[PDB]
Design a protein around this ligand. Structure first.
Ligand SMILES: Nc1ccccc1Nc1ccc2c(c1)CCc1ccccc1C2=O
Length: 346
């Protein structure tokens, strides 16, 4: 009760070659092998002998290359240390082989191994309506939590969604096939947007899960916008009066005017509740777009929705974002976050 530890032992590390480079990790982690071949950024699957589960270990080897990199490393670590939710990738461990700040260079992050991203899942099977309900439900459950912490993903897409063989899903890699899921207001920066940029992305993902194909496969920014307007219709005058960029307003007004298409004619053979939900997600007016919390209560998710089991996050203090610091200062803050990490219970 009042007994304290007067010291602590560093784990024993070992070295090995993986992806043509040396990985140095605690002996806790065994049988490492690369996954994704660079797609997700130096990630190895491993067996965690402590928790007795398969883990994914991600190595950051250039985290402090510049001020921009160092601040991003700090941001990502603070975010990941904060996220504690079934549908958001969080941290089982974070470590460095360094024995002091002086020898600090590499950061390794450890999370539960999922085994695929949603892209791989879509390629390997046609998902049933039940799969789609469950996958989208989990994305929205994760987003409710993330948004409640005043965090926006900003780049939600199938490759940022980890899925396991039990159809469980977690959201990976917060932002800030690359443009197809992006909200229009952030594609051509109309305005200081809101959290529902992520809901637009969910709508695009859900559509693809239902049809088996990309909803708006644009070849560039302008083409992408044209594909969007063809479905949702050209925005009215008042929707224009709300966006700030004069360049944007001018261009879209030169385009041929189009009415909102009938969504039932696009998402054929889909559950009518699914279609109705898509109509609430895929709207241009971000002040009218459904929220994650509102979407969770939509009848489409009647089988999964449980208001008592859709938790929100603790407030997330981002005051560090307003600081302008040197590489060594961001690096020191990051080191502090590494050594102060408290692992989840067993
Ligand atoms: N974001 C973060 C933070 C800490 C540690 C790791 C990660 N990033 C991860 C974690 C797990 C997985 C993937 C990326 C990529 C998708 C994928 C594809 C293929 C096989 C497995 C997995 C998968 O489980």
């Amino acid at each position: 009760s009042h007994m304290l530890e007067m010291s602590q032992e560093r784990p024993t590390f070992y070295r090995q070659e993986l992806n043509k480079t040396i990985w140095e990790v605690p002996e806790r982690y065994q049988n490492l092998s690369p996954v994704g071949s660079g797609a997700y950024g130096s990630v190895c699957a491993a067996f965690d002998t402590k928790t007795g589960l398969r883990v994914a270990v991600k190595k950051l080897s250039r985290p402090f290359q510049s001020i921009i990199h160092a601040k991003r490393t700090y941001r990502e670590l603070r975010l990941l240390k904060h996220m504690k939710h079934e549908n958001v990738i969080g941290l089982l461990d974070v470590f460095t082989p360094a024995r002091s700040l002086e020898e600090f260079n590499d950061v390794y992050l450890v999370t539960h191994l999922m085994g695929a991203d949603l892209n791989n899942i879509v390629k390997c099977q046609k998902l049933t309506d039940d799969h789609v309900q469950f996958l989208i439900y989990q994305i929205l459950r994760g987003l409710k939590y993330i948004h409640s912490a005043d965090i926006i993903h900003r780049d939600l897409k199938p490759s940022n969604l980890a899925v396991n063989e039990d159809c469980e899903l977690k959201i990976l890699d917060f932002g800030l096939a690359t443009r197809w899921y992006r909200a229009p207001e952030i594609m051509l920066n109309w305005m200081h947007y809101n959290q529902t940029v992520d809901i637009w992305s969910v709508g695009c993902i859900m559509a693809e899960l239902l049809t088996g194909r990309t909803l708006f496969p644009g070849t560039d920014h302008i083409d992408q916008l044209k594909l969007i307007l063809r479905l949702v219709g050209t925005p009215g005058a008042e929707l224009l009066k709300k966006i700030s960029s004069e360049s944007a307003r001018n261009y879209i007004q030169s385009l041929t005017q189009m009415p909102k298409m009938n969504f039932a004619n696009v998402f054929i053979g889909a559950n009518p509740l699914a279609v109705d939900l898509l109509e609430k997600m895929l709207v241009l007016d971000s002040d009218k777009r459904i929220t994650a919390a509102q979407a969770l209560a939509h009848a489409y998710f009647a089988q999964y929705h449980d208001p008592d089991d859709e938790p929100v996050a603790d407030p997330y203090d981002q005051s560090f974002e307003s600081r302008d610091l040197l590489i060594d200062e961001w690096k020191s803050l990051t080191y502090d976050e590494v050594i102060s990490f408290v692992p989840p219970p067993l």
